[PDB]
């Protein structure tokens, strides 16, 4: 009953104001033994996806409200290398999607 889809995570974030319990940060996954080049996240952190890290947004692709911050989380991840799907959420709970590895974004909430 894993919450990792665009609609499940977006609805969760907007209701609970945090990610569901299957998410761990990049640092936390690295410390567990995640080696990006080996595509081994599912072996070292079973059931987990990477998420919760601050997203810089220095290229101004996402709208920037002064004082507000963005964070990202992986979507649709089950095993292997990470994919190119990410949910982006602000401290005001605006929610955006990318499926092209942060090239472009579209609003979903
Ligand atoms: Zn770019």
From Swiss-Prot:
It is found in: Secreted. Keywords: Endonuclease, Genetically modified food, Hydrolase, Nuclease, Secreted, Signal. It comes from the Bacteria. The keyword Iron-sulfur does not apply. The active site is at residues 72, 101. GO terms for molecular function: RNA binding; RNA endonuclease activity. Introduced by genetic manipulation and expressed in male sterile maize and rape by Plant Genetic Systems and in radicchio rosso by Bejo Zaden. Barnase expressed in transgenic plants will specifically destroy the tissue(s) where it is expressed. After cell transformation, protein expression and plant regeneration, the active nuclease destroys the pollen producing organs thus rendering the plant sterile. GO terms for cellular component: extracellular region. The keyword Secreted applies. Changing residue 101 to Q: Loss of activity. Its EC number is 3.1.27.-. Hydrolyzes phosphodiester bonds in RNA, poly- and oligoribonucleotides resulting in 3'-nucleoside monophosphates via 2',3'-cyclophosphate intermediates. Belongs to the ribonuclease N1/T1 family. This is Ribonuclease. The chain holds residues 49 to 157 of 157 of the full protein.
């Amino acid at each position: 009953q894993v919450i990792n889809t665009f609609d499940g995570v977006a609805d969760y974030l907007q209701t609970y104001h945090k990610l569901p319990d299957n998410y761990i940060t990049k640092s936390e996954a690295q410390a567990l033994g995640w080696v990006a080049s080996k595509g081994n996240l599912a072996d070292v952190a079973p059931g987990k996806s990477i998420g919760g890290d601050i997203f810089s947004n220095r290229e101004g692709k996402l709208p920037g409200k002064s004082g507000s911050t963005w964070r990202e989380a992986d979507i649709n991840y089950t095993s292997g290398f990470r994919n190119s799907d990410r949910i982006l959420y602000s401290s005001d709970w605006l929610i955006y999607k990318t499926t092209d590895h942060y090239q472009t974004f579209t609003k979903i909430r």
